[PDB]
Structures are given as C-alpha cells and as structure tokens.
Amino acid sequence: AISKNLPILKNHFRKHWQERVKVHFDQAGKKVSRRNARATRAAKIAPRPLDLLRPVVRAPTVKYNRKVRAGRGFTLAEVKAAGLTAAYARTIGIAVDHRRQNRNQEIFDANVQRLKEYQSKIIVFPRNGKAPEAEQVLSAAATFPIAQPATDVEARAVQDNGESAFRTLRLARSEKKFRGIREKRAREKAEAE
Amino acid sequence: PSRFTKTRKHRGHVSAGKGRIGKHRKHPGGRGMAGGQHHHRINMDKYHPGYFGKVGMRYFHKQQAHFWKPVLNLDKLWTLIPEDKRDQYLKSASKETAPVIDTLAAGYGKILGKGRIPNVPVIVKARFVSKLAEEKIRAAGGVVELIA
Amino acid sequence: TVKTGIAIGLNKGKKVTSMTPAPKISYKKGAASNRTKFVRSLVREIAGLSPYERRLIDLIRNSGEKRARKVAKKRLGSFTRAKAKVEEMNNIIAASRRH
RNA sequence: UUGACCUCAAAUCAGGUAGGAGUACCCGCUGAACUUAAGCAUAUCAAUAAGCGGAGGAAAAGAAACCAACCGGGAUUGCCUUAGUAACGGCGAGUGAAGCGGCAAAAGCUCAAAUUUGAAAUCUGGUACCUUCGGUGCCCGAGUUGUAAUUUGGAGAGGGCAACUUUGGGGCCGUUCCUUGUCUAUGUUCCUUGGAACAGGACGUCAUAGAGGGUGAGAAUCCCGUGUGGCGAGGAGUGCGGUUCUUUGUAAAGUGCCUUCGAAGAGUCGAGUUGUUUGGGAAUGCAGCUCUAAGUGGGUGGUAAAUUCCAUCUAAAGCUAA
RNA sequence: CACGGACCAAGGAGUCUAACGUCUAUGCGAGUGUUUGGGUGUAAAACCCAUACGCGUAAUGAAAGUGAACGUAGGUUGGGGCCUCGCAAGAGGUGCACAAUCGACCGAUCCUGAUGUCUUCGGAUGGAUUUGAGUAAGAGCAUAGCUGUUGGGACCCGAAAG
RNA sequence: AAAUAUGUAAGAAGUCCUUGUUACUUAAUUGAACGUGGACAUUUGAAUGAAGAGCUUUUAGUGGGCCAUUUUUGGUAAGC
RNA sequence: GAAGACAUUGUCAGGUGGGGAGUUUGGCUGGGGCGGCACAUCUGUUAAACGAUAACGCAGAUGUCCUAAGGGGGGCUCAUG
C-alpha cells in the first residue's frame, strides 16, 4: 500500500470510471465535420463573414485587466453613438450586447472607431434583387483585428522626485489598513461633549 | 513494448520473480494510504513528515486570480527589451533616451532585486516592487512608475 | 471615486476617464407608482390588519417598540424585514390613533 | 309561469387526443450493498446498479433575481485550463468543484400586470362553394371573470413639436439539397508448366482508371467495378438566382426633441427546523412542517451577528437553432 | 506414509490506463510544450500556426506581507584538468564539478526600535545555540524506454456472505 | 583476578619556529581558537595485505528458520 | 343520530422500542480456554569480565509521593556496642 520515498498520489479511480471514459478518436472527424458544416453555413450565409463584428473590451480581475479582449455585443449607447439602431445592427452583422455597459471612454471610442471603420466596410444589399456581386470574405474578426491600445513610447525622459515608490506603496497599504480605526478616532474625537 | 519487459525474462521461472515464500497476494498492507498512522507510520514520518493534520486558516472560495503577481527580479529585466533596442539603449545610456519597460504588459506583477543591472537610466513601470528592487534602479539613475 | 492610479490602497487600479453609465430602468425595479401606491392604500383598509399584526401593534402600545421587533423577527425572517415592518405600524398608529 | 344564468350532468353525441414500444444518449424521481477504510459505525463505493415516471433527434440548458471587485466582464452549451487546486473528510481512507483565460459555436427574445371603450377589433366549430397544409360568405358558440392591437424592462407608454427613412405577398425555370438511373480507358497476343493460367517468360496497352471483387492458382489490362466526368428521373426547397403576377398602403414600423408618467409575477421571498445532498465549511441546493415579507424594495456579494455603505443584478411566468 | 498430477491436443496467468519517483535516450535549452483549436491535405496521415495555458525561471509565512551580491558572488582545506620552471623528480600559478567548512543574503520567529510622523502609525540600522523543502553567473520542458508506485477486475482462478 | 573478546594511537589535517586576527579569555596579546611566513621527505615515522579506494541513486527478494563445536537458561530428560 | 374545535391528520420534540437492522465481541500463550502479563516500564541476575542478547527464566518495583522530600549555605555525625 505505502512503500518507498514516492510522492503521495491522489488518483480518483475508485468509482466505476471505466464507463464514463471518452477517448476522443473522433478528434480528426470532429475537426473535418466542423470545417464542412462551417464551410456550408458560409455557402448559405452568402457574402457574410459567418461570425459577426465582435467588440473590443478589457477582461476582468487583477490578472487579465491588462489584456484587451474581443468582448461580446456593442452596448445600445455605442450603436446610437455610431448612428444606427440595435433593432437594425443585428440584421447587419454587428453583434450587440444589451447588458454590457460603458464606463471607459478609451474602450468606447475604441468601439465607435471600430464601428465607423465597419460602416465604411459593409456592402449592404437593398431588398430589390439587383444583388451587386462583391465576393464573400470569410472572417469578420480577421478583417477588424485587435491590437492592445498603445500604452507608452519605447523611450522617454527619467522623471525622479524621491518618492521611492516602495514607500508610496507601504504607506498606501497602511492608509487602507487603518483607514477604519483612524475614521473611528475622528468619530470618537469630534465627540468632544 | 512488452517485448523488452522483464516478464518476458520471467517466463518459465515460476514465481514471476515476486518470490515464492511471500508471493504476490493482492493487497498485503491494505490499499492506498491505508494504515498511515498504524503499520505504515514509519514510511510517513520521513518521506512524508507532517502529512496528517490541519495547519493554517481556511480561505473559503479563494480565486487564484486575486493572487496573480508573477515576480521578476532585475537579474533578467533587461530581457523585456527586444534584442535590437537592447544594444542601442545599453551603450547610449542617457536620460531622455531612457527605455520605458512595462513589466505588467510583459506579464509580471512584482519586481524584485537580484543580479544587478548595467549602470544605466531605466524607467520601470510595474504594479508593485521590492525595497531593494527600487534601490538598485535608483542607483542606476532610474525611476519606478507604479501602475496597476 | 477615481482610482489613485496604483496597485493597492483605498482606490486600487488605473484611472481611465469615467463615462457615467446609462440610467437602466431595471435598477428602478422596486418602483412605487401613483398607481400601486393608491392600490395598496385601499387593499390595506379593505382586508385590514392581519391578526398576527394586531398582536404586533398592541405589542408596541404595551411593552414597547424594541420588544415588538424581537417578535417581528421571530415572525418574519430577516431583521430588516422586522424594522421596516415595525416602522410601518407606527404609520398605522399615527393615522387612526391621532389624525 | 316562460326564458336566462351558474354549476353539475348526460350519451355507441361531432372531431380529436392518451396509453404500448424502444429506452445508446437525455430529463427527473427512487435507491442500495459488495467494496475502501487493512477491524467498523462517519465516510467510501454513490447522489452508482437495480426500481419508477417522461421526451427528442438530440434532450436539457438557455439571455441573467449570473460572474465579478476588474481599467470590469456580459445567455447557455461543449472543449483546453483552472485543479487533483479552494474546500469537504473517524481533517482517516478518501472526496473536490467555481470565476478568470483560449477555443468551438453563436441568436435572439415573449407574456401578466394599461380606458379597444367613437365602439371585441378575437377565435373553435357547422355548412356552401372554392383557387384547400386553407380562404371566403353566412350561422352557431366561445368570449367582457378579457380574446385583438398596444408595451416586457435593452425599456417602453400617454399628450405635444418637428421632419425624414422603409416595404408585402404568389407562380415558372436555373441553382441549393435528398434519393437517384444510365453511359463513360485498357489484350484475352506468343512460347513453357499445369486438370485449369490469373504462374514463369517474350511483346504490347490505357493509365485523373495499378481500390476491390469475380473467373477452374498471385488478373490494372476478361467480367463487374475503379477513375474522370456526362446526361436523364422523382421529391424537397424558395437558401438564392434571375423573370413573371400583384401595389397591396390617409398600412405599419423605425428615428429626433419637450414634458408627465412608466403598472414589472407571494403561503411566494426570506427565516426557523427537520431530513437530505453538495467541495459549500454557523448550513450548496432540494423537500417536508411552521412563520410568512417589501417597493429608491427584493436577491446576491462563499465566517454567523448588529450598525453604516458600495457593487451588482431584477426572482417567485414563458419560448429558442449551433 | 504431505498435496496436484491416468494420458494427449488447443486454450491459460504481472496487462492496459491516469498520475508518479529513479535511471537512460533525444530535441530544445531560461526556456519548453505544434496536434483544445485554427490553417492545410493525396484526408483519422503528413505538414503549417495565433493566443492562451501547463511546468519551470523565487522563496517564505498560518496569514497580512515581505522577497535573494560587503566582496572578483566571499574566506579555508581538498580537488581533475590546464599553465609556468624543470631531463626527470618535483616546485609554484590556476583551480570548474564535487566534498567538508566559516561566512554574507531572502522569508519565518524572537529581540533592537533610528529620521519621521493625521501620536500611533513608521520600521532605519543592528543582533539571535532560533527557522526554511531557500540565493549564492539559472536547469528546466517535452517525448520514448526499463524498473518501481498508487487507484483501478489490476498476475490468473476461489469463499462463507451483503 | 585472568584467558577470550574490546576502545584508542602509531604523523605533512604532523612537529618545531615565528607572530597576525578577535566581539572570547586573561592581572597582562596571558591564554583559546584560527592563520602569515619559515624549517623539515618518504627508514615520513610498526607488521601484513590492498582484483583499486571513495560516493550517490534506485529497486527485488526476505522479515516461519534449522543443525554442529564450545558457552549457556529452564527442564528428569527429550531428535524439547 | 353520536361527536365537536377534542379527536383526527400532518410537522418537529422527549420516552419506550433485541420486534427489527448494522456491527463489534484485543494480543501474547509449549493447542486453545481459564490463570497470568512476559503488552509501556525500572533494579539485580540469567548475560558466558565492553556493548548487545531470549524464555509464561529467577527475585522484586512503577501509573505515585515531595513547597520540601526542590535550590543554596552553615553547623553537626550515623547504626550498633
């Protein structure tokens, strides 16, 4: 049962796991079948790029809040900022998100320029029957790529002032740690009679 | 390749080399971590000292994302500078022409202090740094532009 | 708010020009309306006071507001439920009792 | 007394619909012990086998009573990862997810709650005819205890101002798709063995065809097919793609601005307790009993509690491909 | 004078997998890992690839948190090799790996508690028979194999039972 | 108070000279420890032997033992 | 007719509950059982003049007692004849 210097192993195979197994032999087939069902949707979706125009956004938490990612919709404030309506933007292939908001002007103009660049790219066909041939692109995301906003220039001048930075942090830490007790002290001090 | 396996060399030897006085009888010491505190206790203390028992305070629902803070001492640092630019910037070390190194956008949270750096002016923006990390940069006539 | 621009501290994070979000009606979910206001008005006098609440209002006039909340918590659930409730009863007292 | 109405009836009443099957997978319910723990009762095995009810081609899920704490994200599902981690556990054996990230796929929505009220505009049936997956006419009946239009929270509504943009529905033949049918190169030359040639040897052949199978032995070249495409048949189908029939429309919709409004699901929510299950730990969910709310409130924020805040969603109703 | 074996034929027993330790082969090397997925194709092959993500490059605390050069990245003994002198015998210089050893450094703990300060924060500098799975001019990642491990029907057959 | 067993030592990591460090120690650079420089070669400090010496990894089997000589306990003794 | 806000039924809570369910029901040991403890221990011996060394070998002890019976100093000298 337990012998030699081996590292304790936690293998959860005590159940009848031999009936929940899923060897992915269809890995190849799935790929092809997925590319054909995708290449057929295209030869029915006509000149559209399969996928719609997906927005730019900034991923959550302490970790990825430094990586701008292709969001979901386009907020109803940004479509009215583009000039067109949402009850229309979906029928043109500009993925809209009602529940997403807007608290960042950078992310905002990043999307209205993303929408202006696109309203000058679409080749909309009016419901007539003329159908002006303009081939069919296969990627809406490839055509309008994402490039994390340019932060700073490679070079710049050294602006020192003696704040240490390490001290600005250590202090900023305490100012948040004792904010409370110091707030109660100014409460138990302003209470002079 | 069952072709090189020792069982091929144990065919016709009778006990498959598992002994004939103690044989290979299913599970002699129980199964898995059985009798850790009992008979297999010697194998625990030494090889796995301090295995049984609780220790710290439990952190109900802990997201690792809240902890992301990949360190990056100065030892490297100059490595977040593309090969080419490094040559130029290194030799022509001067204020105004100080390279703005974004540790965060690079994929690092804290900046520590290890293998020194060439006496050069360098702007190092990071989320948070070490005392000696900023002390080594401040001697090379450099700043520490805190970010988030 | 405006984040101090640094990793930790009271306002941890980068400060990128706020944009005052849209006024989503759903945030005003618990709407009052001159309608419901006046609707629940009638219903209250129509159906009247629910028998456990009689014990409740009298509970106050007798032993006090503090003791009544103890019984409103052992009646409804959350503590706030009780405070909101008890406070609602003084609105019922103030009316019929005085003017 | 005659006709109502309400409810209950009533039929071999007019028309329907349900069961049973299958049961890989799916949706619940129900539910073990062997086994592991070297004993065994917690636990494990397992929220499994067996038991039971219910569907489809997928089901379920599904547009936020979410995640979050970010510079925020933004239905669901599945996958890589998170992670054999946080956590649970006679803290023994063991057990053990979630958010973020990448990707696959993307799809969005609708009801109740509003004086239609200068007008039930609504629909089942019956019957005639018909251009029928129905239409129209007429007559019953449903129905005001509420069917139509209107609006569903992203909003949106009433009154007011001011202009502008936009069309809908059928044939026919290509195409798209399903099934299809038929036609479509190349020797059966010579010698040897042999019962037999498809074997050996010599000479050629076509080759987008030297996959395969058959034929009296290893046959590309004999046969069928194979390969390249060709050309017909019958459906589906209006995806699109041209033409043709209808201008349907003081029809509806979207857009700007002013103002007043803006209803948003209760024996539910939540709490107590019990059992239960979960990784969920002063309680994850579910259920039983008991109490049983509110409206700038309610839920949520993974250590119970009070106070003071913020963030965040809008339950207790519904639909939907990949 | 223990058990199985009347005789022959064909079956018949240390396997596969998830995760691992050692060792070895190989690629690359502070990187590594194309194969979730995407691109492509003669199509389950082959070949091409973005981003992530994994492990590693930093540890340490229960955690808040902090986080690796006094010096040629140190002194000492020993060191293969290399170098200088020497016919040689040797003598001296240099000494990587590694070994022992005294130190220095980073976190833990116990003490010290400076200039400053929202007068309780701050925590310099300096100590300790105290501690660590650390640093001290990185070695890891992946793939394959032998062997061993654990969970598995788990080398093959076998209970009485539930 | 034996016999048999048994620890150690038999050198260069030494010995001798010299005199450096210290926050130890001393009345005292007294002394301790650790060095600088210096002197001393295998007759360099017994015998014998040395199929090399030193070292790490990993892992199998085993964890029923039994007999003899001599010592020896129980036991009348036992192939106990 | 009887009965009547009591029964009843449902939910928790205490009692009862081998009727029933699950399970346990040490080891050593000149077979086991009983007895014992050779099971954590300590003195002397066995033990063969280092250490080590067994048997249900031999002769005994322990789960305590002590604010002095601990720590330091001073003075003193005990049993017995």
Side-chain angles (χ1 to χ4, degrees):
Chain A
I2 321 184
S3 40
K4 335 304 189 303
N5 212 59
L6 321 161
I8 283 177
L9 300 162
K10 325 197 66 159
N11 292 308
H12 312 48
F13 299 66
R14 284 180 174 287
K15 314 188 171 189
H16 306 29
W17 60 280
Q18 261 174 42
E19 305 172 6
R20 293 167 240 299
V21 175
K22 190 76 70 273
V23 189
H24 280 279
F25 299 108
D26 50 358
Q27 182 159 63
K30 284 303 192 178
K31 177 154 188 176
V32 178
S33 300
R34 181 162 62 274
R35 282 190 62 226
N36 277 313
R38 170 189 305 172
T40 284
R41 153 191 169 61
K44 195 199 77 66
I45 260 297
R48 315 174 197 172
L50 291 197
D51 76 311
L52 329 188
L53 201 302
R54 244 66 205 185
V56 187
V57 89
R58 188 158 284 294
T61 63
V62 208
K63 189 166 176 182
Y64 299 85
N65 71 296
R66 28 75 78 153
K67 263 296 142 287
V68 88
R69 166 176 55 66
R72 178 189 171 68
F74 264 119
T75 88
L76 325 191
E78 298 180 308
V79 289
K80 192 186 70 176
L84 57 179
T85 52
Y88 171 105
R90 291 190 175 74
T91 71
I92 311 301
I94 326 144
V96 188
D97 177 342
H98 75 77
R99 72 191 85 82
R100 200 189 87 199
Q101 282 320 303
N102 243 169
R103 297 155 281 274
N104 200 298
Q105 208 104 58
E106 288 285 305
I107 300 302
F108 188 100
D109 290 298
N111 272 43
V112 169
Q113 267 323 71
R114 181 175 183 60
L115 266 175
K116 247 57 172 296
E117 287 166 60
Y118 188 51
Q119 278 169 290
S120 73
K121 291 290 164 47
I122 51 183
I123 315 295
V124 169
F125 298 152
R127 292 162 296 177
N128 278 63
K130 55 172 66 292
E133 230 57 72
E135 78 183 359
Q136 71 160 149
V137 186
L138 262 175
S139 189
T143 292
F144 288 77
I146 297 298
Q148 344 307 301
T151 308
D152 278 353
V153 253
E154 294 189 57
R156 183 228 294 287
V158 171
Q159 293 297 303
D160 194 300
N161 63 292
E163 250 305 69
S164 179
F166 181 56
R167 204 57 214 292
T168 331
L169 284 174
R170 288 292 289 160
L171 295 182
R173 182 88 56 176
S174 185
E175 272 176 352
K176 173 188 179 295
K177 184 176 193 69
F178 300 93
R179 184 69 186 303
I181 293 189
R182 285 175 166 172
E183 280 191 67
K184 185 184 67 60
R185 286 170 186 164
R187 187 204 310 180
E188 189 180 292
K189 183 52 57 184
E191 66 133 63
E193 179 200 2
Chain B
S2 61
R3 185 186 12 164
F4 311 137
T5 310
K6 242 62 213 85
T7 73
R8 299 319 299 176
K9 256 57 170 285
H10 279 343
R11 275 294 167 53
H13 282 71
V14 178
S15 295
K18 296 291 171 178
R20 50 174 67 194
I21 306 195
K23 305 90 174 305
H24 184 183
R25 286 285 180 54
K26 299 280 179 282
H27 305 66
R31 293 194 178 189
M33 297 305 105
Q37 298 202 280
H38 290 183
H39 46 308
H40 290 152
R41 85 132 52 196
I42 299 174
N43 189 292
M44 288 318 206
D45 308 306
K46 90 174 286 188
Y47 297 29
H48 296 298
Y51 167 51
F52 303 76
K54 291 178 176 184
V55 215
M57 56 191 80
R58 310 162 300 169
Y59 188 138
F60 298 98
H61 164 62
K62 188 197 300 196
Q63 294 102 158
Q64 286 311 309
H66 272 170
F67 276 108
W68 188 73
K69 169 199 295 192
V71 305
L72 194 59
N73 34 30
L74 310 156
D75 182 58
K76 299 279 162 49
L77 186 284
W78 266 121
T79 59
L80 310 198
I81 277 66
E83 302 200 60
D84 37 55
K85 305 304 180 304
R86 191 178 302 169
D87 291 59
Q88 174 178 62
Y89 285 137
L90 258 295
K91 307 172 186 61
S92 59
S94 65
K95 293 181 161 296
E96 307 177 1
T97 312
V100 188
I101 309 174
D102 199 354
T103 79
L104 171 74
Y108 301 81
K110 188 166 213 148
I111 286 290
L112 308 188
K114 205 197 182 185
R116 305 161 169 185
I117 34 174
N119 197 64
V120 173
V122 173
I123 287 186
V124 182
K125 302 174 302 181
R127 294 186 40 177
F128 29 9
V129 308
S130 166
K131 189 183 204 68
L132 218 93
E134 149 276 349
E135 301 205 311
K136 283 180 181 286
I137 293 178
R138 287 282 284 263
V143 285
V144 210
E145 298 186 50
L146 282 174
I147 318 179
Chain C
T1 66
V2 178
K3 319 286 183 292
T4 57
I6 67 174
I8 65 161
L10 290 301
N11 308 293
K12 77 162 76 182
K14 186 191 173 198
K15 41 193 163 184
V16 199
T17 161
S18 65
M19 279 207 72
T20 178
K24 278 203 308 173
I25 265 66
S26 58
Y27 286 150
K28 280 188 63 189
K29 159 66 174 64
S33 171
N34 306 299
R35 173 51 176 282
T36 96
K37 273 278 188 67
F38 151 89
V39 176
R40 294 168 191 157
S41 178
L42 264 292
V43 191
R44 193 54 161 54
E45 69 172 60
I46 292 185
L49 185 74
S50 308
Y52 90 82
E53 303 203 300
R54 298 197 180 222
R55 177 205 328 294
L56 199 302
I57 60 163
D58 280 296
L59 211 303
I60 293 189
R61 293 135 71 69
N62 288 311
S63 198
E65 182 175 355
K66 171 187 166 182
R67 207 270 286 196
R69 302 198 169 194
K70 223 186 64 186
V71 177
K73 190 174 186 294
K74 295 187 66 180
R75 190 53 50 176
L76 304 191
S78 189
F79 197 25
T80 176
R81 300 296 191 72
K83 293 193 304 77
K85 176 67 55 174
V86 168
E87 178 280 309
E88 183 197 7
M89 293 307 107
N90 287 303
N91 286 44
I92 310 314
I93 291 180
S96 180
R97 258 63 275 287
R98 286 77 183 74
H99 313 294

